Amino acid sequence: CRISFGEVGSFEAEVVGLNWVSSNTVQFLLQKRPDECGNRGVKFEPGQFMDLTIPGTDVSRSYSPANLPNPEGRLEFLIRVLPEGRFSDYLRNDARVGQVLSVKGPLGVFGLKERGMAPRYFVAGGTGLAPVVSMVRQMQEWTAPNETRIYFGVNTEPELFYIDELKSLERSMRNLTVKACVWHPSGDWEGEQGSPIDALREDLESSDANPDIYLCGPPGMIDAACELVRSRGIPGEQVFFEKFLPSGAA
Ligand SMILES: Cc1cc2c(cc1C)N(C[C@H](O)[C@H](O)[C@H](O)COP(=O)(O)OP(=O)(O)OC[C@H]1O[C@@H](n3cnc4c(N)ncnc43)[C@H](O)[C@@H]1O)c1[nH]c(=O)[nH]c(=O)c1N2
């Protein structure tokens, strides 16, 4: 018998998916038990989030997964993997489609909180915004048909994408605003638009980000964005920041 002595809030997922959507990005779909397979019953949650190890080891980390508004069970994560790295090699050498991985983390992902009807900006750094984009659409389809602003950024871009996806959101409706990050990096960029988040610093000084500010990505957008706010003055009420994946956030 395997090890078992204290497991409250864990689920079982069968590795069947695991497709490479981008150069250093992959969408893993696991379904093997009630939670993210067939008995979890989804309906669009605040970016569901848990804690799991590649093969269940115990030295990985927590990742906010997303299924979609549908009572079934399908978790899809956007992990930034780098060929020859440390997780991408182990992902294909220990996370193939012939195994079982249990996810443990009856928790949520706090980063973007809409006040109902107000211009809010959510800047996600990277592709791990999968949960971000999921929760984003939920607000618009919920009762947030107002001005919903979203900030998307990463590296050079040739390795990333989803620009048209959010762009369509802006083209769709609800006073949407899409931010164009990246300048000329390559996948190691702390921030968004070429610069030390200086642009956002001025935005506070101007007007368009304060009431509700959502930050998703590296801890930098948290350190710098939080600094500009305290340095300038831009007093916010529904402002929130989250630390996910490497560089890509303010
Ligand atoms: C609530 C919450 C929510 C999340 C997360 C945590 C928490 C608490 N995380 C973090 C989570 O731990 C996640 O699984 C890891 O940070 C992913 O790192 P790997 O272990 O996959 O590293 P991995 O070993 O794969 O390391 C990736 C490496 O790839 C290289 N690289 C990155 N981008 C590149 C590019 N464009 N071009 C070339 N090389 C590049 C870099 O050198 C980088 O260090 C996350 N993580 C995540 O990725 N997405 C998410 O959505 C979330 N969400």
Side-chain angles (χ1 to χ4, degrees):
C1 273
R2 258 271 161 164
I3 300 171
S4 100
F5 254 136
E7 283 237 303
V8 212
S10 69
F11 131 92
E12 257 173 16
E14 159 56 29
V15 300
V16 49
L18 206 242
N19 56 245
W20 306 63
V21 354
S22 282
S23 169
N24 23 254
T25 347
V26 42
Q27 215 165 314
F28 208 175
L29 293 24
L30 314 147
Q31 307 160 57
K32 170 53 188 138
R33 268 228 147 182
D35 257 355
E36 260 153 15
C37 170
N39 284 118
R40 97 83 103 168
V42 221
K43 199 186 49 264
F44 241 151
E45 255 115 300
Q48 253 297 267
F49 159 47
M50 310 219 199
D51 162 40
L52 118 182
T53 13
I54 136 137
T57 76
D58 251 349
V59 194
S60 182
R61 261 241 215 286
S62 319
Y63 188 121
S64 306
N67 322 6
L68 274 142
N70 15 252
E72 262 267 57
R74 298 203 282 157
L75 117 61
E76 324 155 4
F77 75 59
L78 268 162
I79 241 144
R80 249 235 205 87
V81 309
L82 158 274
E84 205 67 35
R86 186 109 281 189
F87 214 85
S88 99
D89 292 307
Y90 199 34
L91 240 157
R92 244 227 266 156
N93 273 333
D94 224 35
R96 277 252 258 279
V97 39
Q99 239 183 110
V100 79
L101 119 67
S102 276
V103 342
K104 317 97 82 92
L107 115 136
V109 69
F110 280 50
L112 110 70
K113 232 47 148 183
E114 47 125 302
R115 208 203 189 171
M117 280 68 141
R120 321 126 287 211
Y121 307 74
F122 194 12
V123 77
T127 289
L129 78 196
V132 162
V133 292
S134 240
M135 218 262 112
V136 173
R137 309 214 132 195
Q138 274 175 259
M139 95 205 269
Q140 297 144 334
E141 243 108 39
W142 259 34
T143 113
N146 214 11
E147 325 236 347
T148 330
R149 331 241 106 165
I150 122 67
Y151 293 158
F152 160 57
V154 288
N155 34 268
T156 57
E157 202 305 291
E159 317 205 2
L160 241 111
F161 78 144
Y162 242 62
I163 120 287
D164 262 283
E165 297 247 346
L166 359 83
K167 273 234 198 141
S168 49
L169 243 165
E170 323 318 84
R171 288 240 268 202
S172 182
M173 216 221 126
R174 322 109 168 196
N175 348 236
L176 270 128
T177 286
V178 59
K179 164 129 248 39
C181 309
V182 167
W183 26 302
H184 197 7
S186 261
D188 243 324
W189 168 223
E190 315 284 20
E192 2 155 330
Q193 252 226 107
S195 271
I197 239 320
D198 260 310
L200 240 325
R201 299 211 244 169
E202 329 203 61
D203 279 317
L204 358 163
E205 247 240 79
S206 169
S207 35
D208 262 307
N210 185 42
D212 344 273
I213 239 57
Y214 323 144
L215 282 165
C216 237
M221 108 294 263
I222 239 111
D223 305 298
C226 175
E227 256 182 69
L228 2 154
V229 191
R230 251 209 120 183
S231 252
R232 264 123 205 73
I234 191 229
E237 323 87 44
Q238 296 272 275
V239 151
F240 340 101
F241 330 122
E242 177 206 334
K243 61 224 94 183
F244 112 62
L245 77 53
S247 99

